[PDB]
Amino acid sequence: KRQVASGRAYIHASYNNTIVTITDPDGNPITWSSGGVIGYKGSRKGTPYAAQLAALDAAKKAMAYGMQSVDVIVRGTGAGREQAIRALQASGLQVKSIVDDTPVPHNGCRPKKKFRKAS
Amino acid sequence: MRRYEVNIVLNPNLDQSQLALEKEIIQRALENYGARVEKVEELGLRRLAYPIAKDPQGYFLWYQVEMPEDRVNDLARELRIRDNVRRVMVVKSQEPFLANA
Amino acid sequence: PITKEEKQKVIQEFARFPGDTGSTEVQVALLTLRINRLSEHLKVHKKDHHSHRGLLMMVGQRRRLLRYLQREDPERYRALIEKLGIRG
Amino acid sequence: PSRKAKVKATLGEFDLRDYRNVEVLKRFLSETGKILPRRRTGLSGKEQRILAKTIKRARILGLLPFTEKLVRK
RNA sequence: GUGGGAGAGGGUGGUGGAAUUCCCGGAGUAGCGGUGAAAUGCGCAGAUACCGGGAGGAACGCCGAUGGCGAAGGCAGCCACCUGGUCCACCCGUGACGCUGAGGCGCGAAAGCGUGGGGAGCAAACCGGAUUAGAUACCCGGGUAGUCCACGCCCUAAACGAUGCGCGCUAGGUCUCUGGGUCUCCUGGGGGCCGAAGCUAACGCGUUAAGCGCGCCGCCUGGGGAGUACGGCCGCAAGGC
Ligand SMILES: [Mg+2]
Ligand SMILES: [Mg+2]
Ligand SMILES: [Mg+2]
Ligand SMILES: [Mg+2]
Ligand SMILES: [Mg+2]
Ligand SMILES: [Mg+2]
Ligand SMILES: [Mg+2]
Ligand SMILES: [Mg+2]
Ligand SMILES: [Mg+2]
Ligand SMILES: [Mg+2]
Ligand SMILES: [Mg+2]
Ligand SMILES: [Mg+2]
Ligand SMILES: [Mg+2]
Ligand SMILES: [Mg+2]
Numbered sequence: 001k002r003q004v005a006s007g008r009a010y011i012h013a014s015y016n017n018t019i020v021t022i023t024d025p026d027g028n029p030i031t032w033s034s035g036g037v038i039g040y041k042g043s044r045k046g047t048p049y050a051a052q053l054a055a056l057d058a059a060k061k062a063m064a065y066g067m068q069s070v071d072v073i074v075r076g077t078g079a080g081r082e083q084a085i086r087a088l089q090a091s092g093l094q095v096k097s098i099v100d101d102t103p104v105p106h107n108g109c110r111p112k113k114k115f116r117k118a119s
Numbered sequence: 120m121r122r123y124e125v126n127i128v129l130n131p132n133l134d135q136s137q138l139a140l141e142k143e144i145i146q147r148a149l150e151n152y153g154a155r156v157e158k159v160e161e162l163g164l165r166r167l168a169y170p171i172a173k174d175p176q177g178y179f180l181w182y183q184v185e186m187p188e189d190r191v192n193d194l195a196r197e198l199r200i201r202d203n204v205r206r207v208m209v210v211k212s213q214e215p216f217l218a219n220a
Numbered sequence: 221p222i223t224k225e226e227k228q229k230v231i232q233e234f235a236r237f238p239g240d241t242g243s244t245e246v247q248v249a250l251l252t253l254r255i256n257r258l259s260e261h262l263k264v265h266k267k268d269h270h271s272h273r274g275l276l277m278m279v280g281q282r283r284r285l286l287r288y289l290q291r292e293d294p295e296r297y298r299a300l301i302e303k304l305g306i307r308g
Numbered sequence: 309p310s311r312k313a314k315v316k317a318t319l320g321e322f323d324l325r326d327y328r329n330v331e332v333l334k335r336f337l338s339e340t341g342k343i344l345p346r347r348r349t350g351l352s353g354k355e356q357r358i359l360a361k362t363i364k365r366a367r368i369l370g371l372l373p374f375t376e377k378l379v380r381k
Numbered sequence: 382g383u384g385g386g387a388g389a390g391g392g393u394g395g396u397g398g399a400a401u402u403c404c405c406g407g408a409g410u411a412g413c414g415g416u417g418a419a420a421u422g423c424g425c426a427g428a429u430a431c432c433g434g435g436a437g438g439a440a441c442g443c444c445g446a447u448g449g450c451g452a453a454g455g456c457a458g459c460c461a462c463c464u465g466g467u468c469c470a471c472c473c474g475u476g477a478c479g480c481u482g483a484g485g486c487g488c489g490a491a492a493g494c495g496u497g498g499g500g501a502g503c504a505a506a507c508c509g510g511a512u513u514a515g516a517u518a519c520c521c522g523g524g525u526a527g528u529c530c531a532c533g534c535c536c537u538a539a540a541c542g543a544u545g546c547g548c549g550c551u552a553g554g555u556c557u558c559u560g561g562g563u564c565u566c567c568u569g570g571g572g573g574c575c576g577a578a579g580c581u582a583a584c585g586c587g588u589u590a591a592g593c594g595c596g597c598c599g600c601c602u603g604g605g606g607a608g609u610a611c612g613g614c615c616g617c618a619a620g621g622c
Contacts, residue, residue, distance in 0.1 A: 012430055016415065019430045027432035028408035034430075036412050043418070074381060075430095085381065100378035105400030106442035106458075109502040110528085114520090116503090123461085126369060162328075168341070168373035169398080173434095177370060181328070192394065192461055199395090206397090208369055209461065213325055218355055220321030221463090224383095231382080235474090241382040242474035250382090261392085261464055269488060270391035270451075274465035276487075288478040341398095342443040353448070353558065354387085360444045361459085367398075368459060374398045375442085 003066035004030055006096075009058065009088055011074045013081030018051040020058040020084055022067065030065050033057035051080030052087045059091035069094040075102045120153065122212035123191060125182035130203045131164050131174055138178075141203045145180065152194040154184035172205050183212070222253060244289050245300050251282040252304050314350030324358045327365040333372055336363060341373035 007030060010021040019034035033054040035045030044050055059067075070093050074081055089095045110116070129141055149156060160181045167177055186194065195209045227250070231241055234249040258275045262268060286306070289297035301307050315335055322332050336344050336359055343363055346356045366372035 008431085010431060017413080017429095019413085021409085021430045023408075023431050026408085029431045030409075032409070032411095032430060034412075036429090037410095043416075097379065098381045100381050103400060104442070105440080106374070106398070108400045108440050108442095109402085109438095110440080110504090112503075128370060165371065167370040168367070169370065171370050188462060195461075196395080206369065208365065208396095208459085210327070210365065210459095211461075215323035216325050216358055217321050218324045218351070219316050219319055240474060242476090244475060244478070246382085247475080258464070265392040265463070268392035268464065270466085271464045272391090273452075273488075274391095277465090285475095285478065288476095292476095292478085336444095338443075340443085343445095345444075346446095349444090353446095356444070357448095363444080364397095364459060368396080370397095374458095 001065070002030075004062075005066055006069040007062065007065075007067050007071075009070045009072045009093075011055070011072060011076075011081060011084045011088070013051070013074065013076035013078030013084065015046060015078050017046040018048075018054055018076075018078060018080040018084050020054050020088075022058050022062040022070065030067070031058060031061040033061065046078065046080060048080040048083040051083040055084040055087035056091055059088060059093050063092070067093060069096055071096045072098045073101050074099065077102065120155075120185050120187050122157065122183065122185050124210050124212055125149075125180075125184060125198075126206070126208035126210065127180040127182075127198075127204060128171065128177040128206040129180070129201075130172075130205065131176040131178050133178065133203065137203070141201060142180070144201060145198065148194065148198050149182070149184055152186055152190040152197070154186040154190075154194065156182055156184050158183045177205060222257060227253070244285050245296060248282055248285050248289070248300055249304070251278055251285075252306070254278055255282065310345070310347040312348065315344060315348055316350035324355060325362060327362050327369065328371060330366065330371045333363055333366050337372065339376065340378065341367075341375040 004024050006025065008023050008025060008027065010023065012019045012021070017035040019032065021029050021032040023029045033056075035050045035054060038050055038053040038057055040047070040050045040053075070088075072085055072088055072095055074085065085098055111118075127145065133141070148154075162179045162181065164176055164178055167175065171177055191209055195207050198204065198207050230249050230253055231246055234243075234246045235241065236243045236245065240246060255275065255278050258271065258278065262272055262275065265271070286297065286300070289300060319332065319335065322329065326332070336349050338344050343360060346352070349356060349359065351359060363372055367374050
């Protein structure tokens, strides 16, 4: 309820899950889906299919707000980042663009062991 | 004393009044620290690659004084105190190194 | 740093004659300059060891030239010292 | 990869120490605010090394980016 | 000496942006997280994902490597100041002023210790979840000392090229970093690789010697007992020699 028309879609991929957020041009979230949301719990939560479903859910739910066009923005390398970007294109929602905004420090905090071993 | 190219980037939303005031202080300073201004250039407003102090632009002042090393840091130290002054890069001079020539 | 000029006034004040640069005095002179500078610096930057070794060497080379001096002309030597500030 | 055109050939004589020449420096930056390699900048060890120091100053002054966002994916 | 060159060489001050955590606001809702699966755990006192503002600590992406600097340990955001070594050219000055070096003195990764400060992330111990025949572990969630700064101490190491320092002599090819030149390549300093002769148990080394020689230092003399005991010296201690 607000008629946002043109928005912004955030795809936060990761090896464990893919959560999708749809916000307004200012960036304030309108709706959001995810592995959990869609029904998958635990492991399959992050498969690419879950991604698909989650992606679609975000659209549909955001469709009511009158959403029609949107700029996709990606983050994470997780398995499932792509499907999301796909579904989000075949949801009617006109995908204005796609971007990689995965953050990366210029070497900052000692990563968790599982992420070090880099030397 | 040595040749130091001075750089300054101050608030882009300054009225001529407020502006001249700051430049006045840049001299007040530069002079106060044995700085003979061999030259200057004022490119003014420039679109910054990234916002500085929330502002999407900045007014640039480029000089080139000659002053006592024992100062410079103090110079810039002082030169920074100002609020409208957002950045000061006192790099030292160096004859150009052409390339692809 | 030590200015080219600064440095020259040293060679003058020590050279055995016009055009003399590498005489065993001028050198002992030049070194005393670098030493008093470094010594100074390190008085303030106590943790700057890498520099200190440079000094430990400088003081070394000097002590070595002066040695040679006191063996080939105990005068120029006994003369250089009093002229500088080495000894007590 | 790398086989594009050498970011140096397609350019004239220029002061590699000019840290305000955004209009030229920018060319040495990647699709992102990342400094290009020599296989792309076509420069030499010494050149590439002086560039780096330059592009880094440009970044502090605010004329050049530290990073940009990738488009299309 | 004079003129030139490169560099993450050291010390002090200042400073930049990315990311993480936390706090503040906004928008938003049921999950997030994590794994081989899970669970502990976090979330309706509204977490996760998203935007804005702030605080703070520690580290510096790309450049960047077959790279560089240092005597070693080791050293990379950027700026200034302070300061060490080193290379080439000129052949200008001194005139064997040299080499090595028992003791001595200094430096010396990490951990660790003392006092004060700081503490974002990480993380011995520890508190939990899981795996297991058990699991005082590997995997997961937490977490204190510590990791950071200052001053003082400790003095170890696969502190490695497992190769002490200096000098002279003995085919070349090729790649590279930095200087000079008549700048198709020559000549010097450094880093690699393939190789003459030669050496070597072999592997390999081979103008960056492990070759041919000279000087000086250090060190070895079967394994276990043992880097232990005693003594001595050093240390606040741990403990070192
Ligand atoms: Mg001569
Ligand atoms: Mg003579
Ligand atoms: Mg130590
Ligand atoms: Mg420590
Ligand atoms: Mg302590
Ligand atoms: Mg943790
Ligand atoms: Mg743990
Ligand atoms: Mg060589
Ligand atoms: Mg060579
Ligand atoms: Mg043979
Ligand atoms: Mg070989
Ligand atoms: Mg025995
Ligand atoms: Mg022991
Ligand atoms: Mg005792």
